[PDB]
């Protein structure tokens, strides 16, 4: 999109020295003991994002045994017959935390509050009806 690739890095964590001094004062963290420190804030260097996106190479085309699949789909469906679903109008959705990111390119002009707050119920129902075709 733009003329230079961005390299994102991941900073290390922060240390709470008072609690560590407390815990060693009360006799924790002994050598050879069972409880210890195993959970840290690991840092990453430059080409971290792409080196993790590259992990999709384990996804390969897969052809399924169509008949046994057509049976197990019925059984799985039967595991799922105690609930109720169906479309609902715009004025019945429940959004917790209307203050998260809105994806790309929208995140250039505010959080999800903006778009969930600048489109009347008519526009939302019209958008649904549109994607239904």
């Amino acid at each position: 999109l733009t003329n230079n690739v961005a390299f994102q890095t991941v900073k290390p964590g922060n240390f709470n020295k008072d609690f560590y001094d407390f815990a060693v004062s009360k006799g924790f963290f002994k050598e050879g003991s069972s409880v210890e420190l195993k959970h840290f804030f690991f840092a990453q260097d430059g080409n971290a994002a792409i080196s993790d996106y590259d992990y999709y190479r384990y996804n390969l085309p897969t052809m399924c045994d169509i008949r046994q699949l057509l049976f197990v789909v019925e059984v799985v469906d039967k595991y799922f017959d105690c609930y109720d679903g169906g479309c609902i109008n715009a004025n019945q959705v429940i959004v917790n935390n209307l203050d998260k990111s809105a994806g790309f390119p929208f995140n250039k002009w505010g959080k999800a509050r903006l778009y969930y707050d600048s489109m009347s119920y008519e526009d939302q129902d019209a958008l649904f009806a549109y994607t239904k075709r």
């Binding site: 006799g27 002994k30 050598e31 050879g32 003991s33 069972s34």
Partner: protein, 176 residues
């Protein structure tokens, strides 16, 4: 004759006694050279130049009395004055098998602190050159309640790591 002790009981499976030279004591020499309390040089049979005899270290009972040395067992009053230094201790061992039989090898080490180390079976095998601290093959005790040790025959550790771990554990437990 004679009262003896399990101390240094040569538990090797081999059947022949020792040649006078390269025998540690008198009892260990074979019977050929033995002619009334003395050994006689028979150049007929020569000396083996390779042999591995696993030695036992079972009952070591020290009550020595010297001046510049502090005795290693204390009474019931002095041990009371010196609490804050008490630490439990218990060991679970194994048995020697294919090259020698008769003794125990330590395998697990507990402490009053929750730590449990575990070592590899080693013993003090002697050799025509000298004594040698080397690996030995073993097997758990046949007691059924000891079956929870069968996995532990495939964990470490070389003793040169284990004793360092012990030193550091005791250090950071009793330094204050």
């Amino acid at each position: 004759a004679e009262n003896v002790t399990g101390l240094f009981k040569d538990c090797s499976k081999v059947i022949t006694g020792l040649h006078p030279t390269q025998a540690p004591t008198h009892l260990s020499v074979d019977t050929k050279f033995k002619t009334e309390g003395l050994c006689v040089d028979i150049p007929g049979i020569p000396k083996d130049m390779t042999y591995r005899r696993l030695i036992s270290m079972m009952g070591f009972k020290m009550n020595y009395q010297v001046n510049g040395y502090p005795n290693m067992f204390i009474t019931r009053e002095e041990a009371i004055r010196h609490v804050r230094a008490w630490i439990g201790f218990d060991v679970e061992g194994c048995h020697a098998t294919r090259e020698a039989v008769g003794t125990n090898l330590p395998l697990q080490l507990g402490f009053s602190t929750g730590v449990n180390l575990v070592a590899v079976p080693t013993g003090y095998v002697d050799t025509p050159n000298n004594t040698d601290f080397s690996r030995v093959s073993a097997k758990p005790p046949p007691g059924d309640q000891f079956k929870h040790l069968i996995p532990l025959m495939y964990k470490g550790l070389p003793w040169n790591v284990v004793r360092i771990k012990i030193v550091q554990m005791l250090s950071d437990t009793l330094k204050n």
